[PDB]
Amino acid sequence: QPLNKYPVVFVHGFLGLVGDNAPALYPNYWGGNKFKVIEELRKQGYNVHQASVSAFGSNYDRAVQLYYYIKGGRVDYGAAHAAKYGHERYGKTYKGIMPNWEPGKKVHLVGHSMGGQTIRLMEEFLRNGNKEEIAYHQAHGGEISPLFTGGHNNMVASITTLATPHNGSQAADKFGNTEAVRKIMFALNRFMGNKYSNIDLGLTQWGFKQLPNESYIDYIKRVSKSKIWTSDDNAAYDLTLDGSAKLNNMTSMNPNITYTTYTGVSSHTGPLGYENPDLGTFFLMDTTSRIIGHDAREEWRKNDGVVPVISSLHPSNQPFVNVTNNEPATRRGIWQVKPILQGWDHVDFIGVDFLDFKRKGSELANFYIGIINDLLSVEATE
């Protein structure tokens, strides 16, 4: 029936809310009003889906949630992980988009922003498992999630990343992960955990769900005891240079997977050799762009608004090849780095920059159809 033999799963980044979990008024994550990725690709005969995972949680938590979003079942973060970081072991339960997912039935994974990192970690778990959970279950018995066992291959065909901070971002180090802004983020999470809330911002495993008979005052008191306030097990930490390097250090290339990256630049060189945001950078990224663009290290300056070029091209010290727009992107086991998209800021990739008239719907349609063509090529050359 579908043109693509393997389902495409699109994985949103940090802050992203999709589908039923998006607020009453809120942008459509995958394509804005410019090109409705899920709906349009379906109309054209492709089998595609948008994952829904934690908007504020760690790559770890998100990767576990991604697994269950696909397979179905009750999210299990692992006994060792839960005990180490101080959050619930078990989380939400998903219906599952492919309940028969197993070695032999493959999926294509495309990640925007942090979605790119989350995808890598989950493949890591399928192939190699999670050593601390393996050790924990050896020592103490119990059940261990099949996600943490290792030895599950032939499950992902491709990893494509768009504006992913593979090497982290200074906008995290110098803003997102500061004490003041973690508190803002966590307060937002506390609030949207109130008993009248219909949206899940992705930190309920830390206690941010008010009980039906609990007063707001008691709720405040209870969740102020949570480890979230001081933990590194959250998105803010993971998006830092250190946080991203840690993930780089525990990932490896899978020789059967087709890897490809896209990167935008939306800054220009000023006097002194610093980078400033172009007119047309979505305005909410103006200051973050300046922070990145005024780095002491010249090669860390050019950026898409919130992620520097050098972070998006590929994980540093993993094998890559610079590739053309025209040739097949069909090499396995190596990061195929696509030519930089000039004038594309971080959110132009997902079409939500309603202020930017240079970035047209028809252009974004071509961009997505291009990705699908590459995916079709991957299928054709097994």
Ligand X SMILES: CCCCCCCCCCCC(=O)O
Q: Where along the sequence are the contacts to ligand OCA (CB under 6 A)?
A: 15, 17, 23, 55, 201, 381-382
Q: Looking at the chain, which runs of residues are DSSP E strands?
A: 8-11, 48-50, 73-76, 90-94, 107-112, 156-162, 258-262, 264-265, 267-269, 275-277, 320-322, 335-337, 341-342
Site string for ligand X, 215-254 (x = CB under 6 A): xx--------------------------------------
Residues recognised as catalytic: 113, 304, 346
Site for Ca ion in 270-289 (CB under 5 A): 280
**First CA to last CA distance, the chain:** 20
Instruction: Report if residue 198 touches Mg ion, rule: CB under 5 A.
Output: yes
Instruction: Please report whether residue 284 would count as binding a copy of itself according to CB under 8 A.
Output: no
DSSP characters for 47-108?
-EEE----SSS-HHHHHHHHHHHHH-EEEE--HHHHHHHTS-SEEEEE--S-TT--TT--EE
Q: Give the shortest CB-269-to-a copy of itself separation in angstroms.
A: 17
Q: Which of 70, 38, 62, 186 is nearest to 114 (CA)?
A: 62
- Using alpha carbons only, give the angle 366, 41, 154 rounded to the nearest 5 degrees: 100
Q: Among 4, 10, 11, 16, which residue sits at the site for ligand 4I1 (rule: CB under 6 A)?
A: 16
Among 123, 173, 233, 348, binds Zn ion (CB under 5 A): 233
Residue with tokens 């029936």: 1
Smallest gap, in angstroms, from Cβ of residue 379 to ligand OCA?
Answer: 12
Does 25 bind a copy of itself (CB under 8 A)? Our answer is: no
**Residue from 6, 14, 60, 85 in contact with ligand 4I1 (CB under 6 A):** 14
Binding residues for Ca(2+): 280, 345, 348, 353, 356
Tell whether residue 304 is a contact of Ca ion (CB under 5 A): no
CB 226 within 8 A of CB 183: no
Q: Which is nearer to ligand CCCCCC(=O)O, 198 or 213 (CB)?
A: 198
Instruction: Round to whole Å and give the CA distance between 352 and 83.
Output: 39
Site for Ca ion contains 133 (CB under 5 A):
no
Q: Binding residue for ligand 4I1 (CB under 6 A) from 165, 193, 293, 315?
A: 165
Minimum gap (Å) between residue 345 Cβ and ligand CCCCCC(=O)O? 12
Other Cβ atoms within 10 Å of 154 Cβ, number:
12
Maximum C-alpha span of the chain: 63
Count the site residues for Mg ion by CB under 5 A.
Answer: 1
Q: Work out the number of other CB atoms within 10 angstroms of the CB of residue 1.
A: 4
Which residues contribute to the site for ligand X (CB under 6 A)?
Answer: 187, 190-191, 194-196, 215-216
